[PDB]
Amino acid sequence: DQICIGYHSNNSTEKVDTILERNVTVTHAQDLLEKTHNGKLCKLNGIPPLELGDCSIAGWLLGNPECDRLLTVPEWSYIMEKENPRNGLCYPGSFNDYEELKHLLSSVTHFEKVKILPKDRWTQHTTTGGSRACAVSGSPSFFRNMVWLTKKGSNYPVAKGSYNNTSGEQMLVIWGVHHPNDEAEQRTLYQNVGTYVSVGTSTVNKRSIPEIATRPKVNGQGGRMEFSWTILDMLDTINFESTGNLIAPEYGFKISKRGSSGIMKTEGTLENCETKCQTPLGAINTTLPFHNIHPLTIGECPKYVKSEKLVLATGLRNVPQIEAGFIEGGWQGMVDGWYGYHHSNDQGSGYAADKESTQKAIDGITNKVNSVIEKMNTQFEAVGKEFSNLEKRLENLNKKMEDGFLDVWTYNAELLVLMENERTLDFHDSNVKNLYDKVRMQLRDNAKELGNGCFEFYHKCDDECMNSVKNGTYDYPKYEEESKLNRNE
Amino acid sequence: DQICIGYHSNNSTEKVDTILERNVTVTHAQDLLEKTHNGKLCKLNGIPPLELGDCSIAGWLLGNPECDRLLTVPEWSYIMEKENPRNGLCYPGSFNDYEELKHLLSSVTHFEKVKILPKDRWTQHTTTGGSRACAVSGSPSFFRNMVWLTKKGSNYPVAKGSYNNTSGEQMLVIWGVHHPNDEAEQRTLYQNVGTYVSVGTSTVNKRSIPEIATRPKVNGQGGRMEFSWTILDMLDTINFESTGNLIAPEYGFKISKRGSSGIMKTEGTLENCETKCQTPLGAINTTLPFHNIHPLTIGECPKYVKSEKLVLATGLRNVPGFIEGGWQGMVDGWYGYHHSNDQGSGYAADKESTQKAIDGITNKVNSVIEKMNTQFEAVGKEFSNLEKRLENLNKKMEDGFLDVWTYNAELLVLMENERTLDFHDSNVKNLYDKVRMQLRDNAKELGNGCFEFYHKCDDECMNSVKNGTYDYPKYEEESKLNRNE
Amino acid sequence: DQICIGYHSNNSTEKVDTILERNVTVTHAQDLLEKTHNGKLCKLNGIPPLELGDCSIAGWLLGNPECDRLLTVPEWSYIMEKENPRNGLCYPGSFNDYEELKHLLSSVTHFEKVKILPKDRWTQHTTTGGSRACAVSGSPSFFRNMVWLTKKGSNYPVAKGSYNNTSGEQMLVIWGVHHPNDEAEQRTLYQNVGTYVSVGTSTVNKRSIPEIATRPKVNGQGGRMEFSWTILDMLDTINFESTGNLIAPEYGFKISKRGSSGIMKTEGTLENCETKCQTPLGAINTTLPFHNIHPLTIGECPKYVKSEKLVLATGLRNVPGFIEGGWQGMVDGWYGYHHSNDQGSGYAADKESTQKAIDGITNKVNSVIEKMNTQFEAVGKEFSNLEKRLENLNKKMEDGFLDVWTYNAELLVLMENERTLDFHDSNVKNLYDKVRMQLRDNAKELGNGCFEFYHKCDDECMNSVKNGTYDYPKYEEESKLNRN
């Protein structure tokens, strides 16, 4: 007649980390970090992205002749753009407030091209101008969405054009101004000097003056074109007026759908998937609450931590018995619960595992795991932004902010996991010791402690007796006289 | 003749949170979060705020005809401004560097209007101009702080004006430039084309040419007015020169008091109170160190946490015999020494561990409060339509710091609660173990958390047993004889 | 024949902090914070810094006559600029994108001055103009690196100049425009009204018209000069064209070395040192992982925390059996195993738990130093008068991150110390429990922390118990014999 106290063990091999010990082998572990991706760019919830290819955003919106497959684009989930696109402004120039326009586009889904100023309304000027920088099949051409107004004969009459926005949504309009490289070019193209371009809306007032300068040749020309933009409100009017150097719009872009999107800098192409979220290096298909692939993601998928390992120990330490109690190790034969309650009566033995402590431990560990997951859902999420050449201070500020927040949250996650692992292992050891202490307490003094975490009963009992002791109903006054009689021997 | 060991219980109904357990009832608890406000917008240490009503800052500084109650304003503590004010720039136009001026005003109290260029000094131009955009009683009018200079007869001579800042402090000066909607209006108003407006200080140099375009009608007019500003230093002069299109100032604004203030975006009005801090939703009157009402506060009052519950467990687990529960009759302390002599009984606690635990828990509470008084404070700012990246950066920074500090506070509270509960349980267990050890073998452990004396003693002997002065070689012989029976 | 358990005590006076307790005396302590400096500005890795003295960066680049000691400058480690330099723009004016240029300079080591437009090529103008706002020995003078172009006789022909960047690296070029204070001065300098200044490169296009206005006399003159800059790429070209009001450059600044550097705001001078980290107050010479002198540092050196005390308790609580306190006689280890046989006595410690405790504590100390290596580093920046919101954003970001990391470090140290002390107490108690259990019932626990053997042992039994080889069946019958 003998019972003992122990704990479950098995043959697993996962390793966990703790604030004191390094690489401790445990029984069960839960993984929280995803470190794999399929390395493909592909669809988001069924809507394919917008593949610019070798074109830039400016070349798309202006109608570069090489970007002729984007003249009508369906709805998109995100925009794919290269780091150094080859096809942008075919005719050299600038694009004022380019990055603000990109920030606006980062949350704009489907466009809709509306002809606001048809090319045939300019009956007092010339509209067939073109440059060899934007050339198709050897002949000169121009942007497909803009009109280059030149003189007709020897006159450049005052050009006027107005549009009232009755489309039903906000409209994006882009105009431009030409800067020649001498006075002869100006007189050859517009037959006027001291010309101007004036644009006016309810919140816009501009009067540009051409700036003639001598410059090197970019794409073969010494002239430059400056492009500006505005967002026209519903039922608002826009007016154009110029005595020269006007690159007038023909189309206007109507914001149609709106939503959450972004601009991804990648060098890959489009394949066939259906993913939930996408990173510049690939697509993620996981249920784990963390990943470490790339800080910038689009869609619905987990948080980013700059760590190589995050494992939560949800079990016991793996120390077996080399070659019968908790002071040596765990038993392989326990396949019922965690905390061992090995018993051995006269007729036989058994390996019944306690349930009152097992369920309490399970509830505790599940609450701990859920809490660890839940306190980290208010993380910092990075949002992409573009900056110009004369905005290095602001770009450094943004980079430092994002990096600092990522570092803080990585530190938080790692430390929380380490401390929770320590507390879990200590808690399990304490639970084994507490069950042993409860057994010894209810036993009183009617058993000789063998020193291996259990005691041979000084009261000779039966299956009912040991079962009741397991239930916690060992009545000392019922079995004190006979036990004392045996102890007197 | 026996004694027992336990702890204290009562009938409180406070619930605290823990890492492994949630909603645990405790004896005593201390709240740290304030969640109530009076819903009123009212005074700050006896100084009323500046109520702009339906007016904007530009309307107040330029003297809109509808903001005529703010011509002379007393000292304030903060400013109330609506989200989309109605009476701003009556004549359509723009205000350059508006957000920078508002940032400057955010830390400026009382002004002092100084008449720097009197209207009568322009004896070569007409100063009676005005528009029906800013109309009072139907007739045209103009801004009350600015002068519209137009032609007199058929000339617009070169207009000059200088001021030397001998007022005694920095002064804010505002001027403007007019943009007509065609050339005919320009000749009808100024007689000249290709005009300019030039302003000169010791650090400002500007030459503005009017821009003529065709524009829709806003407030009935197709023209626009562009306004600019500068801060004049002491003993520094400002020069004005123009051949046309000049809207000259008549008043400068002297900075007089300075201090800590702000601009609060609210749509309410001013009531009668006297509070110590103000939020855009109402005042706060509390001595607790945290609040969760609004991130932007003006005054001296607690830190903001984006949570819903912050309760610190300062007592013991509330379960109604240290291996069986607690006692409802003990009112002395936390750690009990239930004592029962032959002729009497008692319920005295232990008065040495109680003060140690009180000191430890008080130090812990003060340390929790102390570690969190270096938090991050949000500061209001304004951004324009073409500054969306900067606005996004500011909002993300403020939100990130708020989330970080909320996480820190919640983790601290949970870990401290876990430690406190285990600390009290371990203290009770350690006291019982000390009693069992010092009693040696002269006791029969009943098992219910206390033993039965194997030596027969009295009230003084039992007091010595509890007092750490258990003299073993005193009464061990009769105890041995008794256990031998 | 008694054996007792205790922990070693000594005569140290280092105090540490904890969540529950304050000012607790410990045996051994590790300090992590460095709080002193030599208060000297001096060399970093053998390369001296660049000392502008009373000159600003603009004054250094433009060639202020007072900054004639900086005409040629060797390689440098950092730049020393006063908060309010006195010798900057001798002729009043402004510098466009000054802070961007300073940010660019912050990561730029040695410059190399290249003569890109000699002064004698302007054979149709006068190149000897100057002002009394930049005067040397009473006579008028001008910036050394710039040329002021004026009338030659009574004509001002169109000025043209070009440069093709064949130097080998990127180049910085600075030009200017002059704004007179009346029409008469413009005519007496240029014979042209409505002039322009045109600059064009492959990525830069500009045309500036002079602005004339009446202004207060700063430094004696009512005119102003506006200066602009650009970075010219390899094998690129810059063209200058102007009908008047042109301040042409004579030199360009080739970027020669590059590296990690910074601009430092101090009022001191250079002394004869050698250091590896430099803060604006002085140098740092340490092997510790933290410091609290100044947030902005140049070189390699520890992290900045805004605390005055970071001490880690690596030992046991210092109070003079474990149920009474420590032992001053023990010098063996940390956990004691006092034995005393009939023939003699002893003070031997335990060789098993001591190594485990040392390994764990060292692992934890190294971990604490490891988790703070991803800290936040401040980088200096400059902002203009119309950029107060950006300045406030930068200040708040830096201060918030510093506060967050300071909080992290202090909390980690406090929890570490509590865990260390509790761990030592638990280890002592568990060794005592192991001895008590393996001894079984063949002794009477004295009470102070040890037992009195019920059967007389010898030295062999003593070190057998110490080695965990006490055998109950080998000795129980005679033990029960002395039981009576």
Ligand SMILES: CC(=O)N[C@H]1[C@H]([C@H](O)[C@H](O)CO)O[C@@](O[C@@H]2[C@@H](O)[C@H](O)O[C@H](CO)[C@@H]2O)(C(=O)O)C[C@@H]1O
């Ligand atoms: C209306 C128009 O596009 N006209 C020209 C165009 C412009 O005159 C301007 O130069 C824009 O670049 O220029 C194009 O042609 C030219 C060459 O054929 C000529 O040898 O050199 C010119 C410069 O001196 C100019 O480059 C051009 O885009 O190359 C074409 C078009 O006829």
Ligand SMILES: CC(=O)N[C@H]1[C@H]([C@H](O)[C@H](O)CO)O[C@@](O[C@@H]2[C@@H](O)[C@H](O)O[C@H](CO)[C@@H]2O)(C(=O)O)C[C@@H]1O
């Ligand atoms: C010196 C002056 O204030 N002159 C006009 C003024 C300007 O002509 C300009 O329109 C600035 O508002 O405008 C006022 O006059 C006019 C109207 O009464 C009329 O119906 O429409 C005019 C424009 O076509 C002009 O606006 C005005 O704003 O009411 C007043 C004053 O006569």
Ligand SMILES: *[C@@H]1O[C@H](CO)[C@@H](O[C@@H]2O[C@H](CO)[C@@H](O)[C@H](O)[C@H]2NC(C)=O)[C@H](O)[C@H]1NC(C)=O
């Ligand atoms: C742009 O179009 C809108 C609608 O087509 C015009 O708004 C109308 O203005 C007239 C004024 O004669 C009113 O009678 C209508 O009731 C308005 N319609 C709506 C829907 O508001 C607007 O005036 C046009 N813009 C301009 C500058 O004429």
Ligand SMILES: *[C@@H]1O[C@H](CO)[C@@H](O[C@@H]2O[C@H](CO)[C@@H](O)[C@H](O)[C@H]2NC(C)=O)[C@H](O)[C@H]1NC(C)=O
């Ligand atoms: C503006 O007024 C101040 C004070 O009246 C002038 O400062 C004085 O300048 C004279 C030079 O003629 C000195 O002798 C005085 O000592 C100055 N006064 C003080 C208090 O310093 C200043 O010159 C005036 N500004 C202009 C442009 O004339």
Ligand SMILES: *[C@@H]1O[C@H](CO)[C@@H](O[C@@H]2O[C@H](CO)[C@@H](O)[C@H](O)[C@H]2NC(C)=O)[C@H](O)[C@H]1NC(C)=O
């Ligand atoms: C600036 O100089 C470079 C070389 O020093 C010029 O590039 C050369 O251009 C000629 C054209 O006649 C080519 O034959 C050479 O092969 C080019 N050299 C190299 C290294 O590419 C460049 O053209 C010059 N800039 C200008 C505006 O002429």
Ligand SMILES: CC(=O)N[C@H]1[C@H]([C@H](O)[C@H](O)CO)O[C@@](O)(C(=O)O)C[C@@H]1O
């Ligand atoms: C070409 C030139 O530098 N000319 C003269 C300038 C200008 O006329 C303006 O004053 C600009 O300062 O001014 C001085 O008279 C002067 O005392 O500063 C010096 C010089 O004779």
Ligand SMILES: *[C@@H]1O[C@H](CO)[C@@H](O)[C@H](O)[C@H]1NC(C)=O
């Ligand atoms: C561990 O035991 C499991 C029993 O489910 C078995 O499938 C697995 O192969 C074992 N692994 C090793 C390494 O013995």
Ligand SMILES: *[C@@H]1O[C@H](CO)[C@@H](O)[C@H](O)[C@H]1NC(C)=O
């Ligand atoms: C486990 O961690 C220990 C650190 O004590 C390290 O020495 C060992 O290499 C690690 N194991 C593996 C497989 O990396």
Ligand SMILES: *[C@@H]1O[C@H](CO)[C@@H](O)[C@H](O)[C@H]1NC(C)=O
């Ligand atoms: C994601 O992975 C699961 C495996 O858990 C798989 O069943 C599912 O098909 C995957 N989704 C896609 C879109 O491939």
Ligand SMILES: *[C@@H]1O[C@H](CO)[C@@H](O)[C@H](O)[C@H]1NC(C)=O
């Ligand atoms: C207390 O919290 C628990 C969460 O474990 C929740 O189930 C229970 O409803 C809560 N009770 C009250 C009264 O809020």
Ligand SMILES: *[C@@H]1O[C@H](CO)[C@@H](O)[C@H](O)[C@H]1NC(C)=O
């Ligand atoms: C704030 O509340 C306290 C209650 O403790 C009250 O005595 C005090 O009058 C209140 N303050 C005001 C301004 O009403």
Ligand SMILES: *[C@@H]1O[C@H](CO)[C@@H](O)[C@H](O)[C@H]1NC(C)=O
């Ligand atoms: C140590 O800290 C305690 C705070 O508990 C303080 O009372 C005591 O004065 C301090 N001692 C010294 C020497 O600073």
Ligand SMILES: *[C@@H]1O[C@H](CO)[C@@H](O)[C@H](O)[C@H]1NC(C)=O
């Ligand atoms: C730094 O301190 C050490 C002392 O550990 C000393 O040997 C060394 O010379 C010091 N460095 C300098 C540059 O003085």
